[PDB]
PDB file of C-alpha atoms and ligand atoms in Angstrom:
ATOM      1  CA  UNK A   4       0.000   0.000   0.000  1.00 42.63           C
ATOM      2  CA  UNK A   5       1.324   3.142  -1.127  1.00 43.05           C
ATOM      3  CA  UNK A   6       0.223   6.940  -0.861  1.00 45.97           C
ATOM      4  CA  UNK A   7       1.443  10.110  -3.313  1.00 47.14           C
ATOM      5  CA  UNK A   8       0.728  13.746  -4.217  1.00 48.11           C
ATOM      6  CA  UNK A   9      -0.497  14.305  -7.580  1.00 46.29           C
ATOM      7  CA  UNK A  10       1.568  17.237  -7.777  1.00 46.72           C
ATOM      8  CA  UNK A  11       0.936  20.425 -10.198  1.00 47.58           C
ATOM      9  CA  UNK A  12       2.054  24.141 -10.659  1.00 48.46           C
ATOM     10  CA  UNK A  13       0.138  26.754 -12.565  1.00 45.52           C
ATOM     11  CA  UNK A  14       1.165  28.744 -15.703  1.00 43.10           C
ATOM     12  CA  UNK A  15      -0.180  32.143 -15.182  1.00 40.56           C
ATOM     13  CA  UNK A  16       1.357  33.859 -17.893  1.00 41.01           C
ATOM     14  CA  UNK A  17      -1.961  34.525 -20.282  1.00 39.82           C
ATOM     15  CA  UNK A  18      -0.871  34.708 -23.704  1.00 40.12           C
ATOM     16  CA  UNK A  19       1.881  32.588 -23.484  1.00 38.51           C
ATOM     17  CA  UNK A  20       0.556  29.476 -20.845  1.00 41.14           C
ATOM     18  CA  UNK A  21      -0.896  26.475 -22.858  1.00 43.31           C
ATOM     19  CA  UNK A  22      -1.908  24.766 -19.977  1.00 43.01           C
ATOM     20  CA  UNK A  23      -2.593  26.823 -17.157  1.00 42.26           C
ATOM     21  CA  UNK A  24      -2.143  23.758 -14.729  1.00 39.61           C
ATOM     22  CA  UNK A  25       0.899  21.206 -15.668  1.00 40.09           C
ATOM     23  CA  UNK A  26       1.261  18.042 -13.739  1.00 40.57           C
ATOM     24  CA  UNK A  27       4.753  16.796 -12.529  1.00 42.87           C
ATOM     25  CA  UNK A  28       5.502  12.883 -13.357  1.00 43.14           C
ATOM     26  CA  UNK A  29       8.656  10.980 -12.444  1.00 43.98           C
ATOM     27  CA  UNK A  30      10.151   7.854 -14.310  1.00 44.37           C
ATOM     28  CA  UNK A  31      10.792   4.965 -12.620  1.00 45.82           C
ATOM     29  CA  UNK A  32      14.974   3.691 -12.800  1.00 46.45           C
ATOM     30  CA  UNK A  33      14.170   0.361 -13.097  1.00 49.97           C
ATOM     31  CA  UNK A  34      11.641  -2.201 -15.235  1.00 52.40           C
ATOM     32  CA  UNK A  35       9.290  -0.619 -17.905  1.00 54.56           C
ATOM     33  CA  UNK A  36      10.395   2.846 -16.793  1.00 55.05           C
ATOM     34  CA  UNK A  37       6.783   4.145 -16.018  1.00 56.17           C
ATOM     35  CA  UNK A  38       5.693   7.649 -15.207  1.00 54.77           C
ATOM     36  CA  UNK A  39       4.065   8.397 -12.044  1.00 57.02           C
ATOM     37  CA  UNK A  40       3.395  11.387  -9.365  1.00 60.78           C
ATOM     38  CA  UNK A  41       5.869  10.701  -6.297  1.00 63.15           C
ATOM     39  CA  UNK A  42       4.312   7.818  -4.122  1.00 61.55           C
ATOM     40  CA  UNK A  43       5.762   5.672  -1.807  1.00 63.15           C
ATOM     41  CA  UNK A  44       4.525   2.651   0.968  1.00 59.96           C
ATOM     42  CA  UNK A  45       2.795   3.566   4.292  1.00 58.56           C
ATOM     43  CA  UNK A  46       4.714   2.935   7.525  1.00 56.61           C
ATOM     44  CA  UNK A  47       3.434   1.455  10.372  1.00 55.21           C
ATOM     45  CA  UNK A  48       1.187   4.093  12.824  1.00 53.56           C
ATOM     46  CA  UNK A  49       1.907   6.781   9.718  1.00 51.97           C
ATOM     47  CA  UNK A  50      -1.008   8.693   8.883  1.00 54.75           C
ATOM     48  CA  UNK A  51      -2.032   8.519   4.846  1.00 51.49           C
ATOM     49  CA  UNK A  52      -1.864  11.821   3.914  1.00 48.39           C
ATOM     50  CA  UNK A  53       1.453  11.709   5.669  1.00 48.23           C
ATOM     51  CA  UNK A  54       2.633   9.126   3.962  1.00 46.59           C
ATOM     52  CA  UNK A  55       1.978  11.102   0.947  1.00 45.60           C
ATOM     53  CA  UNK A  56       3.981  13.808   2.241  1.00 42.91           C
ATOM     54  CA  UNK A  57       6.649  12.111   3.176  1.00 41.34           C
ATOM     55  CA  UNK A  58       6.911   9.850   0.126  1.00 40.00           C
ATOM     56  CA  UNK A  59       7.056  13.631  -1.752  1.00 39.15           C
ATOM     57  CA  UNK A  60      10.259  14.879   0.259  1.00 39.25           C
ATOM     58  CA  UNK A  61      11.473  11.806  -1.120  1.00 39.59           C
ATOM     59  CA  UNK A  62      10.847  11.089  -4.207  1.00 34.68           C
ATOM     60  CA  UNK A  63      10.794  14.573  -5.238  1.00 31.00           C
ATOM     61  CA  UNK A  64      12.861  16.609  -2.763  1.00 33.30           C
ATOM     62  CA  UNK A  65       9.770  18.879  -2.084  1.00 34.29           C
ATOM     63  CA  UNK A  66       9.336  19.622   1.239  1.00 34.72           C
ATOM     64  CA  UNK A  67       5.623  20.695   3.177  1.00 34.91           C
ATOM     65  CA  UNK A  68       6.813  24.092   3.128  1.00 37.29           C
ATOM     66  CA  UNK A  69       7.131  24.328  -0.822  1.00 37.75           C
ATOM     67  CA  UNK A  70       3.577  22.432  -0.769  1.00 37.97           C
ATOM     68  CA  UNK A  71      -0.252  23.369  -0.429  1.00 33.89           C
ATOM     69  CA  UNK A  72      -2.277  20.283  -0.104  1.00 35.29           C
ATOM     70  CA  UNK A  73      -5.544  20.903  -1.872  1.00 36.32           C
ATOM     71  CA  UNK A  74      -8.645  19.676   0.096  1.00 35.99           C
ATOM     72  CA  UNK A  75     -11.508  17.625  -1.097  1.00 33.48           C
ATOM     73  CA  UNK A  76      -9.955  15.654  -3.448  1.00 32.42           C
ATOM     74  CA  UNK A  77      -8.619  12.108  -3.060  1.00 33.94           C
ATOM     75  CA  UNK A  78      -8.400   8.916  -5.363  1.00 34.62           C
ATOM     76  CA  UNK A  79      -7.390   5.132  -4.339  1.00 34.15           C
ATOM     77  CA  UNK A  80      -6.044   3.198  -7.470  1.00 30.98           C
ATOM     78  CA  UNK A  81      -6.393  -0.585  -7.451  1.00 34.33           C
ATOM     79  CA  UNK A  82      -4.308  -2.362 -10.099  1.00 35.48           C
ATOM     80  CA  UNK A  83      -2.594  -5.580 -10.826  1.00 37.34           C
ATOM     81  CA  UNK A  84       1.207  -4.981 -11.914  1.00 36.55           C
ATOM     82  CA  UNK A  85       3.302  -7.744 -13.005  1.00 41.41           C
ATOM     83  CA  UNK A  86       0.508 -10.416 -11.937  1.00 42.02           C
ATOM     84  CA  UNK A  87       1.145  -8.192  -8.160  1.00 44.76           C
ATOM     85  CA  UNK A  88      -1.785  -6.856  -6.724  1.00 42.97           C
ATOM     86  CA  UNK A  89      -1.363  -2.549  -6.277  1.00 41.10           C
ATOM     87  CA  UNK A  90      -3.280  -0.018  -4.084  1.00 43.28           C
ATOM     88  CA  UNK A  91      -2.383   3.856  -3.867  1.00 42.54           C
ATOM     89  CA  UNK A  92      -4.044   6.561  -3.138  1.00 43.16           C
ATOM     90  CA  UNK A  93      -3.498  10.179  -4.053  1.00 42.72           C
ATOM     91  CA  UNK A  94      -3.942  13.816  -2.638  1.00 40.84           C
ATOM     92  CA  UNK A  95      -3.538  16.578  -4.684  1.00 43.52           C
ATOM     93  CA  UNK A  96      -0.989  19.233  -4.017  1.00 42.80           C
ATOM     94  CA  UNK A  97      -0.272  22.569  -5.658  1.00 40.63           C
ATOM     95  CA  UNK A  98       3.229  23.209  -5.621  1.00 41.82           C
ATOM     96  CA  UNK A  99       4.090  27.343  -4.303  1.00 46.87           C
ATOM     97  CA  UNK A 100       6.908  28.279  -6.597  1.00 44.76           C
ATOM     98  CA  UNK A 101       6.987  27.033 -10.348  1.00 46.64           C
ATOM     99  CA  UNK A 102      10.692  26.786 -10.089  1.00 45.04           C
ATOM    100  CA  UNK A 103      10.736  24.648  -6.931  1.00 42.77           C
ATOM    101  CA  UNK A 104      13.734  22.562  -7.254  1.00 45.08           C
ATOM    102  CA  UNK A 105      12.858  19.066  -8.406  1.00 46.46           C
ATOM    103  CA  UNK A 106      15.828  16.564  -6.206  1.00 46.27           C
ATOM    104  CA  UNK A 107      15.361  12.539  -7.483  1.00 44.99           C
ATOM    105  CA  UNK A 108      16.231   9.527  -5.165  1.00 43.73           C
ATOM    106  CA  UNK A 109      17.680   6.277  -7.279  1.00 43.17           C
ATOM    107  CA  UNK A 110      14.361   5.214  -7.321  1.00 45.60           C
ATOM    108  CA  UNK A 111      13.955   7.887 -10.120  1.00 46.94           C
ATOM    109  CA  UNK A 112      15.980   8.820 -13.387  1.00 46.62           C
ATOM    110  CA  UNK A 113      14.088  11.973 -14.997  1.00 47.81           C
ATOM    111  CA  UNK A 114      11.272  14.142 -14.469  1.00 45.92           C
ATOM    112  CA  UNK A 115       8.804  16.050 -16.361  1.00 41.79           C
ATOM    113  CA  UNK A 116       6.197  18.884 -15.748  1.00 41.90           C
ATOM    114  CA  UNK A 117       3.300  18.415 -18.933  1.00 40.02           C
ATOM    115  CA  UNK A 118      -0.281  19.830 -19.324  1.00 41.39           C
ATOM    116  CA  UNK A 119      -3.146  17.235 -18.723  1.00 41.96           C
ATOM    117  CA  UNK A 120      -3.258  15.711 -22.212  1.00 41.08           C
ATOM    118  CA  UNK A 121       0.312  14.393 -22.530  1.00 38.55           C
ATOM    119  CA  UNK A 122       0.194  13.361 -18.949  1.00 33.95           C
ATOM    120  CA  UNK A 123      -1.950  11.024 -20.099  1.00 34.68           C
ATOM    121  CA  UNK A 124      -0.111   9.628 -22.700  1.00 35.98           C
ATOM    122  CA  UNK A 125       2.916   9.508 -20.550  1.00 35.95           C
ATOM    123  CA  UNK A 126       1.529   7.727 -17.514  1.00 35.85           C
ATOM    124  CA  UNK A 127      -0.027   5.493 -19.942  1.00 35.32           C
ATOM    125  CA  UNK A 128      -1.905   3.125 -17.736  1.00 37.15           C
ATOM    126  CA  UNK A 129      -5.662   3.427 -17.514  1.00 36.00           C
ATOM    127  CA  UNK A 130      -6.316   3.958 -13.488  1.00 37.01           C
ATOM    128  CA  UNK A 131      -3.554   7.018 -13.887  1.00 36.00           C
ATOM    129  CA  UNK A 132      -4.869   8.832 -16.472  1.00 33.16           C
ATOM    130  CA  UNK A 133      -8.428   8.734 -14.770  1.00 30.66           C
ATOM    131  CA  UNK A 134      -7.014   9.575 -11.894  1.00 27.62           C
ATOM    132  CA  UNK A 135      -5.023  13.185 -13.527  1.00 26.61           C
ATOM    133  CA  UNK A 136      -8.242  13.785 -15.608  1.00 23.86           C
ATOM    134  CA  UNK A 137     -10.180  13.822 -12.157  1.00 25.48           C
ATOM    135  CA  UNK A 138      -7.758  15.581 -10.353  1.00 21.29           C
ATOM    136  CA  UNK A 139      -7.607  18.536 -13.265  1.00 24.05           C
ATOM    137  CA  UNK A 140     -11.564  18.020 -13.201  1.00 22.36           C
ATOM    138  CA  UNK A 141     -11.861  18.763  -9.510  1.00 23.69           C
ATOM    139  CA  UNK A 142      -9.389  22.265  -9.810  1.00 24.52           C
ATOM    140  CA  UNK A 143     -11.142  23.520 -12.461  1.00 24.89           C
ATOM    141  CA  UNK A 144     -14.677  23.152 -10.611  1.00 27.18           C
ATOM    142  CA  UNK A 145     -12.837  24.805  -7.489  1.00 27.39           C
ATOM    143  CA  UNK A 146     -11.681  27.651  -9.311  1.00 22.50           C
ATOM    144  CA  UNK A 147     -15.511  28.232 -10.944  1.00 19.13           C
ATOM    145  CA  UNK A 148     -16.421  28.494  -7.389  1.00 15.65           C
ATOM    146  CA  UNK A 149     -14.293  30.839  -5.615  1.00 15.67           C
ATOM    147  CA  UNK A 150     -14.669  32.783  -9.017  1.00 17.31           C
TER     148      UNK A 150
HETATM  149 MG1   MG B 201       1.720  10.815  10.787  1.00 15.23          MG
END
């Protein structure tokens, strides 16, 4: 059982911003090289959501201070992996400066920050894309609100 951040920063320049929200993915340094959020397995009396923010500072090298979890939104994947059953469940977190310094562990070998649609294609897998499609879903409906 693992627990991650899907982690994004906004674009707020107007004419020039594509996506206004971009998505950060890292790729795994070993099998298939997949593309993920930063997630990483619960300890024993750890909270979820810490979890999550733990498995960020990490994974990622971004710490709670460079962070704003985003309430109301969580999604638990179920998947099967290499005939290995898989559970993980997300928060999503906005990071507070676009250039926040991105530091991989060896678990990682590259990173990349992409608007919704090739998120998608990177990640790949089914449960993932749902899962950033929801997530981008969710902001925009906040946003209308507070509007
Ligand atoms: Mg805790």
């Amino acid at each position: 059982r693992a627990c991650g951040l899907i982690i994004f920063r906004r674009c707020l320049i107007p004419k020039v911003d594509n996506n206004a929200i971009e998505f950060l993915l890292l790729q795994a340094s070993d099998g298939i090289h997949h593309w993920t959020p930063p997630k990483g397995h619960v300890e024993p009396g750890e909270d979820d959501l810490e979890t999550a923010l733990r498995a960020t500072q990490e994974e990622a090298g971004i710490e709670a201070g460079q962070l704003t979890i985003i309430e109301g939104f969580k999604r638990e994947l179920n998947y099967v992996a290499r005939n290995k059953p898989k559970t993980v469940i997300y928060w999503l977190a906005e990071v507070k400066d676009y250039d926040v310094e991105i530091r991989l562990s060896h678990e990682h070998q590259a990173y990349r920050w992409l608007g919704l649609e090739e998120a998608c294609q990177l990640a790949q897998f089914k449960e993932m894309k749902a899962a950033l499609q929801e997530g981008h879903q969710f902001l925009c409906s906040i946003e209308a609100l507070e509007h």
